[PDB]
């Protein structure tokens, strides 16, 4: 009942972009397309928290073809429209640094992807990816701990839970627990998706509460730029007590290195008990209740 691999790297399935949107806004630092494709012609079904491939056109510098890259599902099963015909990614543009070779260099998947057209062929293989899925029970709390790109299993969640047209298409679930998502991104209009989560927050202020972390604009105690391990030091003994309820899962995705803060803040509010908290956590993950994407 996951479906895993029905499409494998040696026979892709064929999708073709039906659209291709920005979005970050103007002030904003960098490139992030929302990409939707068209499923239609093949099997691929999905559920949320999942990951596809996408294999880009060409050859590295070797003369080899180009390996395949795996993107979080940035949708819920049913794509963006609820029609099950659809599945869109969250693709930001990687490119790097002048001391690197000479000049700025561009990733190679990320670049195609960030400014293909729609109505071009794309390869895409998954889904794969047991270690991020959401819970059918309408009764947790989950806390969400998002970087940049790392919005987009979180999206997949959230619009499951709160979309009046996926309440209609999902009558087995119902949400109806606590959620929680710390976003961090540079700059108020590189906060992804920006409109339809805080129009979220205000369907349901009972449900879902939203704390952004926002590095250009806000400052830390300290006097740093805020950063996402900042706001969950700022709430560490919320974030604990709410860990502490059978009933509570924890996602965090974004970029590497990010545990790391999460971790010196929740064993400084689980020490305050004589909890250890890296035994804690161990026990944790042993359960599934505790999910980490990063990359
Ligand atoms: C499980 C998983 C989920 C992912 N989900 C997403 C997602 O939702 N959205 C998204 O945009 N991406 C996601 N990615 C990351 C994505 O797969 C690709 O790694 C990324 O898009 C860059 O691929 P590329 O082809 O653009 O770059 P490449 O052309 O392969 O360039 C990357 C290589 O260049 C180097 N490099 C990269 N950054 C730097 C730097 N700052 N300084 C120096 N060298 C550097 C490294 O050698 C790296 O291997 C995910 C990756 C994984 C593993």
Same mark, same amino acid.
């Given at each position: 009942?996951?479906?895993?691999?029905?499409?494998?790297?040696?026979?892709?399935?064929?999708?073709?972009?039906?659209?291709?949107?920005?979005?970050?806004?103007?002030?904003?630092?960098?490139?992030?397309?929302?990409?939707?494709?068209?499923?239609?012609?093949?099997?691929?079904?999905?559920?949320?928290?999942?990951?596809?491939?996408?294999?880009?056109?060409?050859?590295?510098?070797?003369?080899?073809?180009?390996?395949?890259?795996?993107?979080?599902?940035?949708?819920?099963?049913?794509?963006?429209?609820?029609?099950?015909?659809?599945?869109?990614?969250?693709?930001?543009?990687?490119?790097?640094?002048?001391?690197?070779?000479?000049?700025?260099?561009?990733?190679?998947?990320?670049?195609?992807?960030?400014?293909?057209?729609?109505?071009?062929?794309?390869?895409?293989?998954?889904?794969?990816?047991?270690?991020?899925?959401?819970? /059918?029970?309408?009764?947790?709390?989950?806390?969400?701990?998002?970087?940049?790109?790392?919005?987009?299993?979180? !999206?997949?969640?959230?619009?499951?839970?709160?979309?009046?047209?996926?309440?209609?298409?999902?009558?087995?679930?119902?949400?109806?627990?606590?959620?929680?998502?710390?976003?961090?991104?540079?700059?108020?209009?590189?906060?992804?998706?920006?409109?339809?989560?805080?129009?979220?927050?205000?369907?349901?202020?009972?449900?879902?509460?939203?704390?952004?972390?926002?590095?250009?604009?806000?400052?830390?105690?300290?006097?740093?730029?805020?950063?996402?391990?900042?706001?969950?030091?700022?709430?560490? /003994?919320?974030?604990?007590?709410?860990?502490?309820?059978?009933?509570?899962?924890?996602?965090?995705?974004?970029? !590497?290195?990010?545990?790391?803060?999460?971790?010196?803040?929740?064993?400084?509010?689980?020490?305050?008990?004589?909890?250890?908290?890296? /035994?804690?956590?161990?026990?944790?993950?042993?359960?599934?209740?505790?999910?980490?994407?990063?990359?």
């Amino acid at each position: 009942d996951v479906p895993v691999n029905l499409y494998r790297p040696n026979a892709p399935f064929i999708g073709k972009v039906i659209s291709n949107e920005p979005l970050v806004k103007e002030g904003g630092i960098g490139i992030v397309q929302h990409i939707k494709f068209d499923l239609t012609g093949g099997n691929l079904k999905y559920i949320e928290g999942q990951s596809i491939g996408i294999i880009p056109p060409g050859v590295d510098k070797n003369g080899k073809p180009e390996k395949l890259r795996l993107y979080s599902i940035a949708s819920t099963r049913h794509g963006d429209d609820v029609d099950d015909k659809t599945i869109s990614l969250c693709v930001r543009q990687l490119e790097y640094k002048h001391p690197e070779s000479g000049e700025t260099v561009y990733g190679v998947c990320s670049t195609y992807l960030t400014h293909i057209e729609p109505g071009s062929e794309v390869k895409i293989t998954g889904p794969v990816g047991k270690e991020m899925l959401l819970p /059918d029970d309408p009764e947790a709390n989950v806390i969400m701990l998002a970087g940049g790109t790392g919005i987009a299993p979180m !999206r997949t969640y959230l619009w499951r839970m709160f979309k009046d047209a996926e309440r209609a298409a999902n009558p087995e679930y119902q949400f109806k627990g606590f959620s929680w998502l710390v976003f961090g991104v540079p700059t108020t209009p590189n906060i992804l998706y920006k409109e339809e989560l805080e129009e979220i927050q205000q369907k349901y202020p009972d449900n879902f509460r939203l704390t952004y972390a926002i590095s250009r604009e806000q400052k830390n105690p300290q006097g740093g730029r805020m950063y996402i391990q900042d706001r969950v030091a700022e709430h560490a /003994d919320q974030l604990w007590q709410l860990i502490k309820n059978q009933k509570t899962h924890t996602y965090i995705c974004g970029l !590497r290195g990010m545990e790391e803060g999460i971790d010196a803040a929740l064993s400084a509010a689980a020490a305050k008990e004589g909890v250890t908290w890296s /035994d804690y956590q161990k026990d944790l993950k042993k359960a599934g209740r505790w999910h980490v994407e990063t990359y």
